């Protein structure tokens with residue numbers, strides 16, 4: 001029942017547009033065959049720090065790329081310095097990776113492969129205000145960058161018209177997925 | 182318990198939407214003490230709901246998992262029980278620990294009013310995982326009476342948005358939890 | 364531990380929206396190491412918010428769970444602690460539940476550098492819920508962590524319930540169940 005996280009109060013640790021322009025808070029907890037996750041994002045500087053209807057595109061991507069031992073690769077948008085188990089860098093986390101059987105890397109109707117199953121899509125709310133919806137898309141194992149064995153990708157965006165600019169500062173989002181091990 | 186009861190993570194067609202085995206229901210239930218953590222997704226592979234558009238009616242269908250008092254799946258369920266089993270093909274004998282509580286979610290003076298909302302979980306899912314293709318899911322606990330079931334988990338799937346260009350009914354994954362019987 | 368803190372299976376009203384015992388809160392918190400897994404639902408049985416429509420204002424109300432530094436529920440909470448205990452002890456109240464409290468590091472109590480900007484969204488979880496569980500009857504829920512200062516609380520979990528859709532025919536404020544998780548204090 002271990003937890004792999006960014007630490008709960010991270011310094012800027014994540015690239016949206018430029019290095020460390022945002023704070024990703026991400027906690028993964030192993031509940032046997034499923035991982036329970038909570039994620040939130042605050043963009044602190046740059047193009048997406050304060051958004052409005054003039055900003056385009058209205059979506060950006062945060063990639064976590066892992067090798068076959070579940071170690072985060074430096075090509076990830078997330079900086080690995082404080083990505084570790086909750087209390088030395090960790091050696092292995094295959095247990096926390098999204099399953100390549102449930103969520104295979106991209107490649108008879110019984111052989112139709114689902115396009116939806118490897119994604120989780122919901123609204124989040126900017127500043128936690130019910131009248132400031134945006135969206136999150138979590139994707140498992142959809143990346144090919146850096147020859148990753150596994151990947152978790154967060155697409156953040158919005159669609160509602162905001163004429164008065166507001167911080168891109170998401171409510172916390174809970175999700176779960178089938179673990180590799 | 183941290184045990185998992187599931188369809189297997191990559192099932193063959195295993196579920197009836199319109200006809201038998203016309204879809205692949207991926208469902209994993211993991212026991213976290215007396216709450217179950219669940220993840221569900223649906224891919225309809227053949228028949229009326231494989232490719233939907235505004236001309237298909239009705240725009241909602243029901244998938245019932247019906248259990249006896251040992252938590253064993255009854256064959257009247259929409260889900261085929263052949264590979265519904267604990268993660269580890271001998272069929273399991275007991276899974277009451279994974280059933281929705283009949284105290285928190287009973288089968289159907291202001292102080293004595295009973296909640297109709299609490300046995301349901303309702304949310305959007307997104308076909309193909311695209312933010313512009315919403316559909317919906319309703320998870321219902323213990324609301325079936327079919328086959329003298331002692332427990333039930335029902336998944337209602339549907340959509341409301343107009344889709345003139347047809348799209349596969351291929352849901353994003355949906356997470357939920359519920360109070361376990363024991 | 365892997366225990367559960369919940370509203371106990373007594374069927375009486377256990378919560379105050381507007382007046383004492385006008386509502387029935389269902390909440391279960393289950394500890395998964397450093398994360399809490401939760402499910403919450405609310406039925407208002409009497410008073411202003413039992414049956415709602417567009418002529419009811421405001422369209423939001425708040426249910427506060429306030430805890431001391433041992434994780435014990437304070438009597439200033441909207442939830443009547445008569446009905447709040449570990450699931451198992453019927454007459455023995457719990458002494459300690461710090462492990463179920465929302466982290467004050469992840470979710471600090473409210474109080475120049477952009478890099479030191481404090482997230483306003485992170486301590487909230489916001490979603491639709493659906494009245495009666497009907498897909499055409501959306502309402503909303505806002506779960507907030509540690510944002511209260513009432514009663515010198517050490518920790519808090521606040522549920523704001525409301526709705527925005529225009530309703531002509533009155534409908535019971537009877538929410539679908541909502542799952543969420545949060546980072547635990549320890």
Ligand SMILES: CO[C@]1(C(=O)O)C[C@H](OC(C)=O)[C@@H](NC(C)=O)[C@H]([C@H](O)[C@H](O)COC(C)=O)O1
Nearest residue numbers: 123130131133422490491502503525526527528
């Ligand atoms: C009017 O449209 C919206 C909006 O974009 O603002 C849609 C918005 O719903 C979504 C999914 O974006 C809704 N928010 C929630 C969490 O219910 C939101 C609220 O229901 C609404 O702002 C609440 O208003 C009142 C009267 O309390 O309404």
Ligand SMILES: CO[C@]1(C(=O)O)C[C@H](OC(C)=O)[C@@H](NC(C)=O)[C@H]([C@H](O)[C@H](O)COC(C)=O)O1
Nearest residue numbers: 058122123134135157158159160305312313315
């Ligand atoms: C126009 O309304 C909709 C739609 O039917 O497409 C509603 C849709 O929201 C819902 C609850 O269906 C929304 N998707 C999400 C995940 O929020 C979706 C997104 O806001 C929109 O597609 C995103 O647009 C941009 C500019 O990225 O907008």
Ligand SMILES: CO[C@]1(C(=O)O)C[C@H](OC(C)=O)[C@@H](NC(C)=O)[C@H]([C@H](O)[C@H](O)COC(C)=O)O1
Nearest residue numbers: 304305316317339340341342491498499500501
């Ligand atoms: C027309 O707008 C709405 C509504 O307010 O009723 C928006 C409503 O969505 C939201 C986010 O409120 C939607 N329900 C769901 C769960 O997606 C809902 C359903 O798609 C719609 O009611 C579907 O109709 C039936 C009965 O199948 O449509």
